Amino acid sequence: PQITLWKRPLVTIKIGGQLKEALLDTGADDTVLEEMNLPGRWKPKMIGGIGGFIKVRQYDQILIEICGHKAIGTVLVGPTPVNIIGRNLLTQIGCTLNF
Amino acid sequence: PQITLWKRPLVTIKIGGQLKEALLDTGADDTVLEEMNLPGRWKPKMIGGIGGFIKVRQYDQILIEICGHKAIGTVLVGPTPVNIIGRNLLTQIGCTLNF
Numbered sequence: 001p002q003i004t005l006w007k008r009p010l011v012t013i014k015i016g017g018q019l020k021e022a023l024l025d026t027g028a029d030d031t032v033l034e035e036m037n038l039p040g041r042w043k044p045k046m047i048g049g050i051g052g053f054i055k056v057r058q059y060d061q062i063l064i065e066i067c068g069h070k071a072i073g074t075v076l077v078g079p080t081p082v083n084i085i086g087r088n089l090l091t092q093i094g095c096t097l098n099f
Numbered sequence: 100p101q102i103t104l105w106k107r108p109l110v111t112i113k114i115g116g117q118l119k120e121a122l123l124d125t126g127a128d129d130t131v132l133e134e135m136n137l138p139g140r141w142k143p144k145m146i147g148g149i150g151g152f153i154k155v156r157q158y159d160q161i162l163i164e165i166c167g168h169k170a171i172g173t174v175l176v177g178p179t180p181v182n183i184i185g186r187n188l189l190t191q192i193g194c195t196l197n198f
């Protein structure tokens with residue numbers, strides 16, 4: 001679809017078999033989701049945002065469907081203020097900015 | 100143009116008579132710019148993201164050119180690590196997400 005930006009670009013995602021709402025975030029390199037239970041192995045990692053750095057759990061090669069488009073990539077889980085879909089997955093679904 | 104998301108969507112902006120590089124950020128409601136000493140009145144604000152909050156100065160009706168597209172709106176100035184063009188200005192330049 002074509003998504004205008006007068007409202008937050010929020011979309012439904014499927015991850016670990018569960019539906020969630022997430023923000024399409026072109027300013028995020030990576031995808032960061034709020035605390036949740038995910039199956040598989042993970043590794044401790046750090047990520048920095050506008051306010052500093054936080055600890056996250058890094059899940060690699062995770063299936064995630066974004067607005068009906070399938071992706072398989074890295075998902076970071078930790079105390080992010082909002083579920084954000086970053087460029088690592090936006091590229092997989094063929095997302096571009098246009099003006 | 101069409102901007103792919105393999106790398107950060109950085110573009111040149113003009114604000115306060117200065118040229119800067121900034122992110123086209125669909126995940127930001129508002130525009131946040133690196134410390135700069137703009138003239139005029141401002142109001143204090145605190146904005147939160149990954150890592151926590153930073154203190155910024157809110158300037159209203161600021162002229163800003165993004166890739167030759169003119170816009171006018173609110174800009175928040177503070178110790179952000181990167182210049183962020185938010186939806187309040189992205190809509191004014193006709194920017195959309197597409198996939």
Ligand SMILES: CC[C@H](C)CN(C[C@@H](O)[C@H](Cc1ccccc1)NC(=O)O[C@H]1CO[C@H]2OCC[C@H]21)S(=O)(=O)c1ccc([C@H](O)CO)cc1
Binds near residue numbers: 023146
């Ligand atoms: C809550 C949803 C978002 C986190 C919100 N942010 C926008 C994001 O795009 C942010 C931009 C960014 C910040 C710092 C460095 C590089 C990019 N990217 C980000 O954190 O990405 C993370 C994951 O991937 C990595 O790559 C870059 C960092 C890592 S924000 O800046 O904190 C913000 C909060 C409130 C408002 C209000 O509108 C003010 O009024 C405007 C903007």
